[PDB]
Design a protein around this ligand. Sequence first.
Ligand SMILES: OC(C(F)(F)F)C(F)(F)F
Ligand SMILES: OC(C(F)(F)F)C(F)(F)F
Ligand SMILES: OC(C(F)(F)F)C(F)(F)F
Lengths: 232, 227, 6, 7
Amino acid sequence: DREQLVQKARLAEQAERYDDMAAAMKNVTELNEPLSNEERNLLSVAYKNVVGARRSSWRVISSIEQKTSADGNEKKIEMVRAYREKIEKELEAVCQDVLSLLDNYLIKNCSETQYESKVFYLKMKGDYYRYLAEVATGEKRATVVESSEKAYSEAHEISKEHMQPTHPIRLGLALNYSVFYYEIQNAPEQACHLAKTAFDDAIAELDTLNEDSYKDSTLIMQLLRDNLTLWT
Amino acid sequence: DREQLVQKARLAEQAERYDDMAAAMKNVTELNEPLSNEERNLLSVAYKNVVGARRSSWRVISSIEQKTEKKIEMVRAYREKIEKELEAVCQDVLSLLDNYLIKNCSETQYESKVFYLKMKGDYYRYLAEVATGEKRATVVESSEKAYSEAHEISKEHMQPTHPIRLGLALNYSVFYYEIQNAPEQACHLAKTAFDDAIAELDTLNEDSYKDSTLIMQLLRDNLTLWT
Amino acid sequence: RSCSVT
Amino acid sequence: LRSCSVT
Ligand SMILES: OC(C(F)(F)F)C(F)(F)F
Ligand SMILES: OC(C(F)(F)F)C(F)(F)F
Ligand SMILES: OC(C(F)(F)F)C(F)(F)F
């Protein structure tokens, strides 16, 4: 039953078993039925935690690899390198699973008028291609970087046309898109322009904040300001 | 390459990948040589974190099952899934203990003997936490037998201020209180250990004072909780 | 719950 | 610090 797969995902989240949570929401998605706002969040939370654990480990391993390389022990250097590659393979497999779900079920089943869902899922697509770009090199990197920008750009145009500036999905898309410009493309001026425009557009309509959007939107506004403070 | 397996366990710990850390230290153990104190602690830390994540998840699900019909049968099935995982972790540790670790203790490596027998009692206790009925009674007896063997060695050979002797008393008393539901035995064991260690607290160095007083605080906190 | 070795 | 994304 679908209601049992979703309740199992809710159980797995409370028990902090995010692999189980992602597997349950992956099964719900493959039922080829649309996800509710809550089911969409369950899927996003699960895979963010699954991929986030690998990203966190990858950063620590990469930092240790730099120190190890300077000390010049080739056996230890090769051990750390192989362990980074092992984590990179796991992260890439997680990203491919999400991206497959997005392209084959989630983005596909969006009706012409489901703008919020389309922006959410296209933003997710840009996010997981960005996570691939974080650990890719060479020609494999340029490809996923180009796929990340294509997904973010399409999400941005739909969001600008159809969504309010204080909507958390529109704000969150701008935040992550600006991070993509800064960290992945190394385009600080583009990053700053997008973050600053989205920030002011929302501030201009702060009175439109509702009880369901206030916490989420103002948190993202704070993060836009924090990034802008850091990048300038 | 032993030294490289140990480095991998250290690397996994920093990456917070404790299943990888346990796999590395399991590989070190299967080399069939006595573990150094450093290796012994890495093995213990690894499996403590692996089984501890399952214990924490089980307690969340078990509370949900109690506090919460079609949803109930799903909660019970999910709890059993976690139980099977936890029981497989304990099975691997107990097999390492019975086939390598306890076996490879020399006749007079009493510190390691107490450490590993206490560990054996711990992991049978974790099995008992999730068992019912006749299966529960079996692992409860195994846990008690291991703790008791560790206790007799610890009393004969270690001083009351030794952190392993104190930690054995702490966990053994928790076994009495939480598993056997024998709070009088639990209280007597914890109080005796605390009082017998008080005698030689002035003799300890700065390092030993910290490790021993830490466990004495846990003994004291348990005793106040129980009364 | 009671505390074991931490 | 590092750049922050949606949390
Ligand atoms: O919101 C504005 C911006 F964009 F942050 F500068 C103002 F500074 F005017 F508040
Ligand atoms: O707080 C800043 C200000 F002052 F509004 F310009 C920022 F642009 F960073 F939001
Ligand atoms: O220092 C002793 C101790 F450790 F507090 F028990 C004395 F009993 F002397 F206070």
